[PDB]
Design a protein around this ligand. Structure first.
Ligand SMILES: *[C@@H]1O[C@H](CO)[C@@H](O)[C@H](O)[C@H]1NC(C)=O
Ligand SMILES: [N+]
Lengths: 221, 204, 167
C-alpha cells in the first residue's frame, strides 16, 4: 500500500521557479533516500539529484548545480524539488523515486505519477470542448467523441463517464495549430442500440488552467 | 561511464522471441518497462533478478559492460519502452512494437457542432478507427475540390489489446467559408483498401 | 584559514584533524573534472567509516585515530556516488579556535593536504582534474561543520575549505 503522489502539472515563464512536491505514504519516510528523475519529452530518462531524508544533505547532477534545490518535510513526509533559472528547454515530466531496499538507491521500485512542468513565454489558455456527436456510422455500432480545441499547454486528460467507459476509448495526441495552440479529440465506439438508453460524457481536465469540464455527447436532430 | 541501449525500434509478432542489448561503459543493473502513458516499472533489479510478480518470460543477463533483456513469449500487453539503468545513468530507446495482420480502417465523419459554429470556427473531423499498419493517407475535399493547408491529423499509439492504430484528421474553416459550400468529403487510403474509401456528407 | 562559528568555540575545543568524509558529485559532465563535496549522508554514513574518535563531529574528523603510513581511502562503492568516501590522513592539520567567533587553521598546509587527497583520488578515479567545493546544503548539523566538544555542539561555516581546483 505504498504511494508516492506528486503535484499537478503547471506552467512557468522562462527564468521563473517551480517547486514540485512528492507526498509519500506507506513506509518510514526518513529511511529511504529520495531521488528526482526528469523524463525529457520523448528523449529518455536523466537523473537530477538525490536527498537524504534525515540529514537533508543533497547530491545533485553536475548538469543542474546552481539551478536546483531539494528539500523535505518529514513531519508530513513530503519531498520537494525546486527548479530556478527555468529554461524553456526544460519542459519535461518530473518524477520522484525511492528504491526497494533502504540500503541501496538507484533501483527505483516506486515512482510518482509524474508532473509535467511547461516553460514558455506564451500564456495559458483554457480548452474549448465540443461534441463530435453520433451520426450514420457502423456494423451496427456508433462512434462518438469530443473535440478539445484551442488550448495550451499540454497536458489535457480526457476520460469517459468518470473512468467507467474505457474499452474502445481512443484519445489522440495533441496537434499543434499554426497559432501555437493545441487541439485533440477523444472518441469511443458503442452499440447503436444503447444510444437512447445510455448517456456518455467527456470529462476533460486541464490543470494548467485549473479547468474541469464535463460534456454530454448526444445524437443529432 | 555512459551507456547505450539497442536496438532503438523493434517490431515483432506475438509469441516471437525478443532480445535487446544494453552496452555500458553480477553488476548493479536494472531494467524498467514504461507502458504508454504510465511511469516506469522496475522489471529487473540486479542484472538478472526479476521483480515480484514479473512474469517468467522476462529474463535479464550479463556480467561485464554488456547486458541483455529478453522476452520469450511476447504478448500484446508487453508493448512498451524499455530502459536499462546503472547507478545514475539511463539508456533510453528500445521501443517494442508489435506486428499484426492487416486491418482496414473504419471511416467516420463528424460535422461541426452548432456551439463551435457560434464560436466562429467550423471543424469537421474524420476518424479512421482500428486499422493496421500505421501508413494511411487522408484527403479533404470541399465540393469535390482538393484542399491543402487547413487540416491537421494525429495517429494514436498502438493499442495494447488489439495492437491497432487509429487516426483523426480535423479540417478547420471559418463559419462563413464553411457555409459557402455544400459537400464535405473525407477520402482515405490504406493497404487493406483496394479503392480509397470516401465517406462524405452535405449540410442538407 | 578562518572558519567562522556560531557558538564561540572555547580554546579547549581545538582538535587535530584525523580524516574526513566526502561525497561524489553525481551527473555526467564530460569535462575532465571530478567534484567532491563534504558528506551529505546521515550519521550512518559517518559511522560506517569506523574512525571512532573522542569527538563526535560532522564534515571532517577530529581526535580520531590517524593512518599507519600514508592516506587510506575506503568507500563502500566508488562508482556509486550515494555512498560516501571516508579518508584517513597521514599527518593531522591542527585546527585551533581563537576562543572568540572565528576558528582558524593553517592557511596553506590545508592546500597541501587537499592536493594529497586529490592525487589519492586521481589514482582511484580518472587521472584528471579534481575540484573541492563546499556542501550542497542540508541541516545545520551537517551543512555547517559541527563538533560536539565538552557537552556542547559548535557549528562552523566550512565554506572556506572547499573552493579548490587541481589540474
Ligand atoms: C579533542 O576533543 C576534545 C573533545 O572532543 C577536546 O577537548 C580537545 O580540545 C580536542 N583535542 C585538543 C588537542 O584539544
Ligand atoms: N539513511
Amino acid at each position: 500500500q505504498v504511494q508516492l503522489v506528486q503535484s499537478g502539472a503547471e506552467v512557468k515563464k522562462p527564468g521563473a521557479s517551480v517547486k514540485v512536491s512528492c507526498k509519500a505514504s506507506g513506509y518510514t519516510f526518513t529511511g529511504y533516500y529520495m531521488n528526482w528523475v526528469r523524463q525529457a519529452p520523448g528523449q529518455g530518462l536523466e537523473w537530477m539529484g538525490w536527498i537524504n531524508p534525515n540529514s537533508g544533505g543533497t547530491n545533485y547532477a553536475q548538469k543542474f548545480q546552481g539551478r536546483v534545490t531539494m528539500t523535505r518535510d518529514t513531519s508530513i513526509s513530503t519531498a520537494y524539488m525546486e527548479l530556478s533559472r527555468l529554461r524553456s528547454d526544460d519542459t519535461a515530466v518530473y518524477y520522484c523515486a525511492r528504491g526497494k531496499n533502504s540500503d541501496y538507491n538507484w533501483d527505483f521500485q516506486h515512482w510518482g505519477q509524474g508532473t509535467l512542468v511547461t516553460v514558455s513565454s506564451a500564456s495559458t489558455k483554457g480548452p474549448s470542448v465540443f461534441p463530435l456527436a453520433p451520426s450514420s456510422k457502423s456494423g451496427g455500432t456508433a462512434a462518438l467523441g469530443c473535440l478539445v480545441k484551442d488550448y495550451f499547454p499540454e497536458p489535457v486528460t480526457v476520460s469517459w463517464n468518470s473512468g467507467a467507459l474505457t474499452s474502445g476509448v481512443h484519445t489522440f495526441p495533441a496537434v499543434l495549430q499554426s497559432s501555437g495552440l493545441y487541439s485533440l479529440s477523444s472518441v469511443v465506439t458503442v452499440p447503436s442500440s444503447s444510444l437512447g438508453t445510455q448517456t456518455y460524457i467527456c470529462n476533460v481536465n486541464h490543470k494548467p488552467s485549473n479547468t474541469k469540464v464535463d460534456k454530454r455527447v448526444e445524437p443529432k436532430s | 561511464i555512459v551507456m547505450s541501449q539497442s536496438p532503438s525500434s523493434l517490431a515483432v509478432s506475438v509469441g516471437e522471441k525478443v532480445t535487446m542489448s544494453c552496452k555500458s561503459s553480477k553488476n548493479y543493473l536494472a531494467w524498467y518497462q514504461q507502458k504508454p502513458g504510465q511511469s516506469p516499472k522496475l522489471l529487473i533489479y540486479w542484472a538478472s533478478t526479476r521483480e515480484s510478480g514479473v512474469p517468467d518470460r522476462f529474463t535479464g543477463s550479463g556480467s561485464g559492460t554488456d547486458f541483455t533483456l529478453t522476452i520469450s513469449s511476447v504478448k500484446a500487453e508487453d508493448l512498451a519502452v524499455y530502459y536499462c539503468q546503472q547507478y545514475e545513468m539511463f539508456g533510453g530507446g528500445t521501443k517494442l512494437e508489435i506486428k499484426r495482420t492487416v486491418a482496414a480502417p473504419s471511416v467516420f465523419i463528424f460535422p461541426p457542432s452548432d456551439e463551435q459554429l457560434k464560436s466562429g470556427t467550423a471543424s469537421v473531423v474524420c476518424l479512421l478507427n482500428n486499422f493496421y499498419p500505421r501508413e494511411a493517407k487522408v484527403q479533404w475535399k470541399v465540393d469535390n475540390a482538393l484542399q491543402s493547408g487547413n487540416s491537421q491529423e494525429s495517429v494514436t499509439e498502438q493499442d495494447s489489446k488489439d495492437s491497432t492504430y487509429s487516426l483523426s484528421s480535423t479540417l478547420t474553416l471559418s463559419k462563413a467559408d464553411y457555409e459557402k459550400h455544400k459537400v464535405y468529403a473525407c477520402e482515405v487510403t490504406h493497404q487493406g483498401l483496394s479503392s480509397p474509401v470516401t465517406k462524405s456528407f452535405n449540410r442538407g | 584559514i578562518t572558519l567562522p562559528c556560531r557558538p564561540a568555540p572555547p580554546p579547549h575545543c581545538s582538535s587535530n584533524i584525523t580524516g574526513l568524509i566526502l561525497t561524489r558529485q553525481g551527473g555526467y559532465s564530460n569535462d575532465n573534472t571530478v567534484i567532491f563535496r563534504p558528506s551529505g549522508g546521515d550519521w550512518r554514513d559517518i559511522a560506517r567509516c569506523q574512525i571512532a574518535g573522542t569527538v563526535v563531529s560532522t564534515q571532517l574528523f577530529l581526535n580520531g585515530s590517524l593512518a599507519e603510513e600514508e592516506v587510506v581511502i575506503r568507500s563502500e562503492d566508488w562508482r556509486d556516488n550515494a555512498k560516501s568516501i571516508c579518508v584517513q590522513l597521514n599527518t593531522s592539520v591542527e585546527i585551533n579556535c581563537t576562543g572568540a567567533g572565528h576558528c582558524n587553521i593553517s592557511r596553506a598546509k590545508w592546500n597541501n593536504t587537499l592536493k594529497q587527497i586529490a592525487s589519492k583520488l586521481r589514482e582511484q578515479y580518472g587521472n584528471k582534474t579534481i575540484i573541492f567545493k563546499p556542501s550542497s546544503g542540508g541541516d545545520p548539523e551537517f551543512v555547517n561543520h559541527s563538533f560536539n566538544c565538552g557537552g556542547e555542539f559548535f557549528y562552523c561555516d566550512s565554506t572556506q575549505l572547499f573552493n579548490s581546483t587541481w589540474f
